[PDB]
Design a binder for these strands. Structure first.
Ligand SMILES: [Mg+2]
Ligand SMILES: [Mg+2]
Ligand SMILES: [Mg+2]
Ligand SMILES: [Mg+2]
Ligand SMILES: [Mg+2]
Ligand SMILES: [Mg+2]
Ligand SMILES: [Mg+2]
Ligand SMILES: [Mg+2]
Ligand SMILES: [Mg+2]
Ligand SMILES: [Mg+2]
Ligand SMILES: [Mg+2]
Ligand SMILES: [Mg+2]
Ligand SMILES: [Mg+2]
Ligand SMILES: [Mg+2]
Ligand SMILES: [Mg+2]
Ligand SMILES: [Mg+2]
Ligand SMILES: [Mg+2]
Ligand SMILES: [Mg+2]
Ligand SMILES: [Mg+2]
Ligand SMILES: [Mg+2]
Ligand SMILES: [Mg+2]
Ligand SMILES: [Mg+2]
Ligand SMILES: [Mg+2]
Ligand SMILES: [Mg+2]
Ligand SMILES: [Mg+2]
Lengths: 357, 98, 141
RNA sequence: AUGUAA
RNA sequence: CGCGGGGUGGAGCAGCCUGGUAGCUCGUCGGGCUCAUAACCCGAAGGUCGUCGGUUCAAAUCCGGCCCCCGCAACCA
RNA sequence: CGCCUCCUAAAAGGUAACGGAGGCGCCCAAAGGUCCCCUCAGGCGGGACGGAAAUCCGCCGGAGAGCGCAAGGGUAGAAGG
């Protein structure tokens, strides 16, 4: 089977030369070598950085796909020289330096996973109904259970966080915690609206019926609740209270105002007779105003998700699972697997790996 | 303490519990040292007075259980952050009366 | 930082800082020591500041021994209250220290390091201090 | 009481 | 550290004061009725009693310390 | 807000503060008198149900148990059973 475990390294390298543009990097690496050779290249050492480390960023690409096309050809002659001589050491020595090139190739395939800051966080998966109706709430449930079987395969945690079962039959919404390694990297290329076309069991006269559902994936960042505030940027003002009180309100600076310098937020207090029973309050309320603003940043980011996703609607598919003629076209890339009821069982590798490009 | 402990090379520090030992002996017989082979000690290991090879005419006057050396883990700045964020349970006052 | 895990009583009378140390006046573990030259209550926050100061200096290696412990609860009335209405609340813990106490010791470290680490630590403390080295006199105790 | 969407 | 009322299954609540049994409604899981769902019917699972420290043979319950929570109070200059 | 125990209280007594901590407003017809007899807590080992801890056996044990309830003093050469 070893001559078939080098044939899979020939396919994994061609797909690596296709998306990475083996020609637009063999060419770009040549223009960097033409500029850095001149000793008069250190004229603005900032420019030399983005070229000297870029040349090492293109020599980790061009030169690696050169030692994979030549290194595997030297193994196609080393495995037939140990069979026709009964030499059993030439055959331990043509696979050892073959599994090291399978790591040089597997490492360079992590130019698909190393494209997203932090692609190992125990991500979450949000499937929502919408479109189709009761048919799609069934469809959203089938798409729910499908990803569960997916995570069952590659080895993750499937903790459902939040559900909402459909009114008639099905699921309106689900949140799954995909706790694992490279978890966000895998499911990241699933963010979209999956389309289902089939005979609806819910339609009175059993017609052919389209129903949509979405899956949205985000990684895991933590609480990020309260933020520290040192008095080095707070400016506490003091003055006299206003209104009733008598003499002990005329000669007493009992009211306080705490103005935060970088934020620009002001806050006062004057309730109690003591300046520091008021300053206690003014720190309290001040914590509150910063907690509001730092909240408003995140809710603004929340609406950024809402306003950039959308919309579990018709002209909005990424993949189309049509069960009435047995096909699942991923109109993004796009594969055309005919095993509909095998993808619904969790064979999304056919799509994930091919759609990380 | 003869030898350079293996623990020390791996980053440890040799804590010398006793720098001398208690012994019964004659004035005509007073030793200048007692050598001790500490080179075998890793980090987390210890020697006791039992491993003390006594020169002839010299008698241990403490329990052989008495420990005389140890190779302990070093200080580490990498540990500092954990120490600062270590939360403490407030002291418990032992109940008096009913 | 340091404080008793539990105690018989929550609060203590203040007492006095008369006399030289009762004990703890000779080097007992490490090679060098930082000895107190003046009487004081040393806060747990001071102890820790002294501690962290040394380990930051040693960077990696050496061993620090803390020979003082803050078992004395410190009391302060809530701010801007009047006198009376009982004893203030416990705000922290302190170690009573008198002249001659060996507060810290280090070992497993070069002389240069121990002098320097113990010097900085002293700067974290509210009293005058002295760096000392293990003696026949100490071992003789 | 209800059963969307070819 | 103002006074006094609380924190109990998923939700909302009883049971404390008279110490040994944690109960009610909803929800939930399984089965039914229906072409299907709701409603309805049968059956089931479910609780560190906010914590830390112990009193008592035994603490949801009695007594303190801390943590949040609701209500009242904060007057005379 | 009266009473009891400890500390503050500076080795007689006594000694203040809206100083630090707890308890009392009962109970027992035996939990009382007197004779007679007995000695604990705990640890180790062994042992049907049986366990960290039911009872049993052995060894170790000056009192750290018990003495109705707070605390202190006292106490097995009993005030305890
Ligand atoms: Mg919903
Ligand atoms: Mg039909
Ligand atoms: Mg007025
Ligand atoms: Mg005034
Ligand atoms: Mg001493
Ligand atoms: Mg101070
Ligand atoms: Mg006072
Ligand atoms: Mg100083
Ligand atoms: Mg001594
Ligand atoms: Mg409706
Ligand atoms: Mg109970
Ligand atoms: Mg049902
Ligand atoms: Mg409580
Ligand atoms: Mg009176
Ligand atoms: Mg006493
Ligand atoms: Mg007296
Ligand atoms: Mg008087
Ligand atoms: Mg009372
Ligand atoms: Mg009676
Ligand atoms: Mg009696
Ligand atoms: Mg009788
Ligand atoms: Mg036994
Ligand atoms: Mg048993
Ligand atoms: Mg038993
Ligand atoms: Mg006793």
């Amino acid at each position: 089977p070893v001559n078939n475990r080098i044939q899979d390294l020939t396919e994994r390298s061609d797909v690596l030369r296709g998306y990475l543009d083996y020609d637009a990097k063999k060419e770009r690496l040549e223009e960097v070598n033409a500029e850095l050779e001149q000793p008069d290249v250190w004229n603005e050492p900032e420019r030399a950085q983005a070229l000297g480390k870029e040349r090492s960023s293109l020599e980790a690409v061009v030169d690696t796909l050169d030692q994979m096309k030549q290194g595997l050809e030297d193994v196609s002659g080393l495995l037939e020289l140990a069979v026709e001589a009964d030499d059993e050491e030439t055959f331990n020595e043509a696979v050892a330096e073959l599994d090291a090139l399978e790591e040089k190739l597997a490492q360079l395939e992590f130019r698909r996973m190393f494209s997203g800051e932090y692609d190992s966080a125990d991500c979450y998966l949000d499937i929502q109904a919408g479109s189709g109706g009761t048919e799609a709430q069934d469809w959203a449930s089938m798409l729910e259970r499908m990803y569960l079987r997916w995570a069952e395969s590659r080895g993750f945690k499937t903790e459902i966080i939040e559900e909402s079962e459909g009114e008639v039959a099905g699921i309106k919404s689900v949140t799954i915690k995909i706790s694992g390694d490279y978890a966000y990297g895998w499911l990241r290329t699933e963010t979209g609206v999956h389309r289902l076309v089939r005979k609806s069991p819910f339609d009175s006269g059993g017609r052919r019926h389209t129903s949509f559902s979405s899956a949205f994936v985000y990684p895991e960042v933590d609480d990020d609740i309260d933020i520290e505030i040192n008095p080095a940027d707070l400016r506490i003002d003091v003055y006299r209270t206003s209104g009733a009180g008598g003499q002990h309100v005329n000669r007493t600076e009992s009211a306080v105002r705490i103005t935060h310098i970088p934020t620009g937020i002001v806050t006062q207090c004057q309730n109690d007779r003591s300046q520091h029973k008021n300053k206690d309050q003014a720190m309290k309320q001040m914590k509150a105003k910063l907690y509001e603003v730092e909240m408003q940043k995140k809710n603004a980011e929340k609406q950024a998700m809402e306003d950039n996703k959308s919309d579990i609607g018709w002209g909005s598919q990424i993949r189309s699972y049509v069960l009435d003629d047995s096909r699942i076209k991923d109109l993004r890339t796009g594969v055309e697997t005919r095993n509909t009821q095998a993808v619904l069982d969790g064979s999304l590798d056919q799509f994930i790996e091919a759609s990380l490009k | 303490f003869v030898g350079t402990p293996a623990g020390v090379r791996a980053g440890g520090v040799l804590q010398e519990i006793h720098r001398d030992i208690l012994v019964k002996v004659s004035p005509r017989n007073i030793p200048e040292f007692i050598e001790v082979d500490v080179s075998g000690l890793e980090i987390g290991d210890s020697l006791h007075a039992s491993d003390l090879k006594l020169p002839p005419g010299v008698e241990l006057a403490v329990s052989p259980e008495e420990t005389i050396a140890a190779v302990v883990p070093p200080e580490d700045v990498e540990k500092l952050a954990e120490e600062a964020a270590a939360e403490v349970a407030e002291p418990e006052v032992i109940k008096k009366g009913k | 930082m340091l404080m008793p895990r539990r105690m018989k009583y929550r609060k203590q009378q203040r007492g006095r800082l008369k006399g030289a140390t009762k004990g703890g006046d000779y080097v007992a573990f490490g090679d060098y020591g930082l000895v107190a030259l003046e009487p004081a209550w040393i806060t747990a926050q001071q102890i820790e500041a002294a501690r962290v100061a040394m380990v930051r200096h040693f960077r990696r290696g050496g061993k620090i021994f803390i020979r003082i412990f803050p078992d004395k609860p410190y009391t302060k009335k809530p701010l801007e209250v009047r006198m009376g209405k009982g004893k203030g609340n416990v705000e922290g813990y302190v170690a009573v220290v008198k002249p001659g106490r060996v507060m810290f010791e280090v070992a497993g470290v070069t002389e240069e390091q121990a002098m320097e680490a113990l010097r900085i630590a002293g700067h974290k403390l509210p009293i005058k201090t002295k760096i000392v080295r293990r003696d026949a006199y100490d071992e003789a105790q």
